[PDB]
Write a protein that binds this ligand. Structure first.
Ligand SMILES: [Cl-]
Ligand SMILES: [Cl-]
Ligand SMILES: [Cl-]
Ligand SMILES: [Cl-]
Ligand SMILES: [Cl-]
Ligand SMILES: [Cl-]
Ligand SMILES: [Cl-]
Ligand SMILES: [Cl-]
Ligand SMILES: [Cl-]
Ligand SMILES: [Cl-]
Ligand SMILES: [Cl-]
Ligand SMILES: [Cl-]
Ligand SMILES: [Cl-]
Ligand SMILES: [Cl-]
Ligand SMILES: [Cl-]
Ligand SMILES: [Cl-]
Ligand SMILES: [Cl-]
Ligand SMILES: [Cl-]
Ligand SMILES: [Cl-]
Ligand SMILES: [Cl-]
Ligand SMILES: [Cl-]
Ligand SMILES: [Cl-]
Ligand SMILES: [Cl-]
Ligand SMILES: [Cl-]
Ligand SMILES: [Cl-]
Ligand SMILES: [Cl-]
Ligand SMILES: [Cl-]
Ligand SMILES: [Cl-]
Ligand SMILES: [Cl-]
Ligand SMILES: [Cl-]
Ligand SMILES: [Cl-]
Ligand SMILES: [Cl-]
Ligand SMILES: [Cl-]
Ligand SMILES: [Cl-]
Ligand SMILES: [Cl-]
Ligand SMILES: [Cl-]
Ligand SMILES: [Cl-]
Ligand SMILES: [Cl-]
Ligand SMILES: [Cl-]
Ligand SMILES: [Cl-]
Ligand SMILES: [Cl-]
Ligand SMILES: [Cl-]
Ligand code: NA
Ligand code: NA
Ligand code: NA
Ligand code: NA
Ligand code: NA
Ligand code: NA
Ligand code: NA
Ligand code: NA
Ligand code: NA
Ligand code: NA
Ligand code: NA
Ligand code: NA
Ligand code: NA
Ligand code: NA
Ligand code: NA
Ligand code: NA
Ligand code: NA
Ligand code: NA
Ligand code: NA
Ligand code: NA
Ligand code: NA
Ligand code: NA
Ligand code: NA
Ligand code: NA
Lengths: 113, 5, 113, 113, 113, 113, 113, 113, 113, 113, 113, 113, 113, 5, 5, 5, 5, 5, 5, 5, 5, 5, 5, 5
């Protein structure tokens, strides 16, 4: 598996709401911080990472770990204060924390029967 | 905490 | 994906010879060190890790990351000094380093044509 | 089939424009109205329903009907007056009616040959 | 999906014994009662429904819901009083209730070891 | 593989006519006789067995053997004297022996060419 | 494809009601009439045919046509006068004609809404 | 299955050499002779048949038999006297018999070792 | 392959950033310009084309080329000046050129380690 | 998808007879005429095209369009005047027109019944 | 399914540690004890069984049960006293019991962080 | 894998033009030269080989290598001097060398734009 | 197919016991002897071969034959005198002959019933 | 004309 | 409550 | 010895 | 009546 | 207008 | 040049 | 009796 | 060096 | 109780 | 002649 | 550096 910009490798995600924060965690083991990039653009968060390809002159006996470009885009709802995103990378897990900023007097749709 | 699948 | 002892989750592996050492690396993100266990028994190295299941009372919006028991067994050749294995865990990568201890006067099989 | 928040069961949809209204219908048989929730957030409509799991102490001879959490999200165009959504549930069909509110002087892209 | 008499669309079924009654429920959303037909013939119950095809002149933006002929046949055991079947259709669920009429002095097969 | 009443595990079957008897054999290893049940109802024989699930507190290193509810139904022809069924269980094989009771003056359909 | 008694080759079927007769046609090309057998037993019609295997000493350049035992069983409804079945074989098509004998005062199940 | 000119239905074929004749047989049950066409063009034999579609106003209970256009093309070797092809249709089998006309002094390629 | 409004045929896409312009190209061979429609609505560009079905009275010997409705929707980022889209169609390729209009003082998310 | 000489990319084809001409059309969008080559050799027409690979230094965000070598070979019947082939390329469609030159007194094979 | 020496049929296995014993159980119904062979060679246990093929002159109506050669090889760890293996066969289950003989002062690999 | 005349085993092929010769190589290991046959008939080369089946009385522990009849047919272009084919078999590779004999004044098809 | 050290191409194997010798044969056509390497290490035999990739400047018309690194490892039983392995390569078949050296007084496991 | 699929 | 699967 | 598949 | 597939 | 599939 | 896959 | 597969 | 795939 | 999968 | 599959 | 796949 070698991810490219046009066909990125995907990384698995857990996402959950923790009270007033929305949290997303990605398994992104073995990434150098120079690679990690988090782009925010209105409601959309894009995570991009790279793991370099193995030296072509190196004979691997096993080479199962995914390499190249990783990318995933999250479309967040309007109540997420994307501007206040906090990001951390530890133990090979990229964790994003976005505050939830509920609008006042939210719509509640009733269903007719 | 809304997200689009 | 929930790995059990009888059907463990598998983790990807790179393995290569680096001069006088054999190196194996596993992607094992987000493991607490209390979980990691490396068992050596003659020539066989077994790696076992656990990532706890999510609290059943927690509503996840995405839960793609593999959880439960991870396990992989490596059958190493006789020239690997398994007794002198060195193991490290950083950035979510479990790295094993086994010294290579070549026997004297190794057999070289010739092929008749 | 048991849908969860993180892996919802999906329900089939018909959608069509009827003059000045956009209509969406979902097959959602056997849902108690207490379960149905329709969330609107800017242009996105999210439909959520639940059908309870069968009593574990009940021996079913056939249990093919999907149960648990159903969810589907619709990304609507800007001309849809989502604020004026009307929703009804009858004969096991959830019907949504959204007025279409065309903007003035819409862009018409010409193609060069 | 367009079901025909020769290749009917199938509808999911739950079936269970409730004391002295056998109950079967079908998800059959959005069926006009003029369509529903339940034929009983000795021990076999056949359920037939139709959902009309969409007007060919109607441009659907999504048309995932199954249409055409639905049919399923149930072969019931001898203890089911098929003559006394009760059928109801509500919330898009077709429910059948057949009284169970156990024969006297039923056979109990013993197994030799 | 865990069979339930609504989705039973299936067991393989050999069936053959031996002169005046019809014989069916099932591979049903490791079943306690308290579990085995053979129900006959007119022409239909139903075989039901259960193999208990493994103690959840037991860590299995391999657990490939199918467990839970096994069930298979045989629809027998009219010439089978189902009332005189004989059943035995040995070496993990459930064997059924049904006498064949041919009707007098059987129909022989001729084909026109 | 070589059909056996235990795994018969299947032949395609058209079946339809023609007023007071039920008609079934099978594609069974290249069958010698000595092979064709039609067994009727209460409501069940069983069609059995054989096409001999190719002489093992014959080198075929193509041998795509199915050979061996063909078999299909039809479970007919109670209104079919199976005793009065008529069968013909022409142009490689086996045609069955069964008179329909409706019972008096048939049940018509009404559905409650 | 409905074959068209652009996507013909295919029919199974046996082909073999019988001394001085090459024989091909096709399973083509239920074809009216008005439909069958055999075109020969240099070394290529094309077989074309049609089985009419079922009357759209006829409700079939089973309609498994392939209908529409059947076609298969055979590329024959130079020794086949295609001009002297003989064709017969019986019992739903289309049989072609082409005389084999070996050229004088045929090439025999020897292989160097 | 016949695309409809509800199940459009898809056309392959290349997309890339060329300095201050974002370019998208679609393979859309054999489209009459009367068919091509490009709709822009906020950040979303929708491309719609139609290739007419073949005259039903025309016997095609091969008809592999996709026909009917083609449609693809692109969700563009906020920095794309969709209002200034330029579109051209030549050599069967639909090319879109959207100017990139970067916002001032863009957010750069830093990751904690 | 990158086609090579040994594993060419394939392009879809429509082919039909138009009175005295046989016409073949290929979807071949975005080909430079310098690439297109049509080779005729007795009855066989071979179409070869190339679409250059993307500059390796160009980061594509999507690169779905097939590139490299395209090739398809048509085996034409004897009545096709391949020497008089006419070829045109417009709107990304390669169109071939071959006159049909029927031989005198063609064979008409009769089938015995 | 007919297992051979070169492609043995496989039998399902449960394996678990029970204090000071390692236990393996195989579903091997309907095996004559003359067939069962257990070979031990250093750390490897090989289980071999045979179930005879059905008499070719016997017409089976169903023959689903696997027949022929069954074989499975277990590679046991060094702490298993293979020499003291105990084997029993009852109710169609082959049970192996191997005492666990832990070495003194076992290695415990520590992981650096 | 056991190849027969009617379903031959296939062998992989490399083919390339080397100046004035066309070369084809087949992987055909372990063939006795008595088996190899190369038939040429106008433009078509047919390669046929046989590898005998294993003695049925021999118990193989692995028998993965393909056996029986191998066959592949090559349709060569008119410029190939098939009469002057040269064939050699060494190291388990069957190599064919066919001289290329270009016709004078070859057609070059021009494409209109 | 291009085999690498980390994902070797596999070659098919026959293996059998011939009295006092164990024989393994590999289909390895077209290998230069400089490539073949057989490594023995305790009980494990590893076979490694390479077939060079085709010159990138060579346009192949077919290139189906597998190239690159081939490797297969055999785990042999204790009775195999691996030190006395004999290897030969002819007709594209690599043949290994290992003497069988049975230990004295071998264990024979009896099974309790 | 009843038949069991 | 018998039913044939 | 009839049985329904 | 726009909707995103 | 003959063509080989 | 942002685009949503 | 030659035929092309 | 023509060959038919 | 070690075993190789 | 033992070998591990 | 030997390892069994
Ligand atoms: Cl990936
Ligand atoms: Cl919480
Ligand atoms: Cl690395
Ligand atoms: Cl896994
Ligand atoms: Cl190095
Ligand atoms: Cl966690
Ligand atoms: Cl870390
Ligand atoms: Cl679902
Ligand atoms: Cl309307
Ligand atoms: Cl319910
Ligand atoms: Cl209702
Ligand atoms: Cl359906
Ligand atoms: Cl109850
Ligand atoms: Cl409707
Ligand atoms: Cl099962
Ligand atoms: Cl007998
Ligand atoms: Cl148990
Ligand atoms: Cl079949
Ligand atoms: Cl009629
Ligand atoms: Cl025949
Ligand atoms: Cl077909
Ligand atoms: Cl003969
Ligand atoms: Cl007909
Ligand atoms: Cl006839
Ligand atoms: Cl498409
Ligand atoms: Cl650039
Ligand atoms: Cl057109
Ligand atoms: Cl392609
Ligand atoms: Cl015309
Ligand atoms: Cl381009
Ligand atoms: Cl153009
Ligand atoms: Cl098996
Ligand atoms: Cl215990
Ligand atoms: Cl037996
Ligand atoms: Cl027993
Ligand atoms: Cl093959
Ligand atoms: Cl060259
Ligand atoms: Cl051999
Ligand atoms: Cl391979
Ligand atoms: Cl021998
Ligand atoms: Cl080579
Ligand atoms: Cl050689
Ligand atoms: Na949540
Ligand atoms: Na998203
Ligand atoms: Na290495
Ligand atoms: Na290993
Ligand atoms: Na619409
Ligand atoms: Na949507
Ligand atoms: Na029940
Ligand atoms: Na039933
Ligand atoms: Na029998
Ligand atoms: Na049955
Ligand atoms: Na009918
Ligand atoms: Na039936
Ligand atoms: Na022949
Ligand atoms: Na042919
Ligand atoms: Na780009
Ligand atoms: Na998009
Ligand atoms: Na045509
Ligand atoms: Na062709
Ligand atoms: Na255990
Ligand atoms: Na093992
Ligand atoms: Na070439
Ligand atoms: Na060819
Ligand atoms: Na052997
Ligand atoms: Na092995």
């Amino acid at each position: 598996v070698l991810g490219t910009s046009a066909r990125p490798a995907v990384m698995p995600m857990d996402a959950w709401r923790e009270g007033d924060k929305f949290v997303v965690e990605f398994d992104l083991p073995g990434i150098d911080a120079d690679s990690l990039d988090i782009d925010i653009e209105r409601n959309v968060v894009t995570v991009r990472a790279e793991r370099p390809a193995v030296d072509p002159n190196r004979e691997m006996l096993a080479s199962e770990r995914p390499r190249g470009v990783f990318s995933r885009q999250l479309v967040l709802g309007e109540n997420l204060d994307t501007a206040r995103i906090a990001a951390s990378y530890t133990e090979g897990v990229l964790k994003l924390q976005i505050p939830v900023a509920e609008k006042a007097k939210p719509r509640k749709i009733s269903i007719t029967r | 905490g809304r997200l689009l699948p």
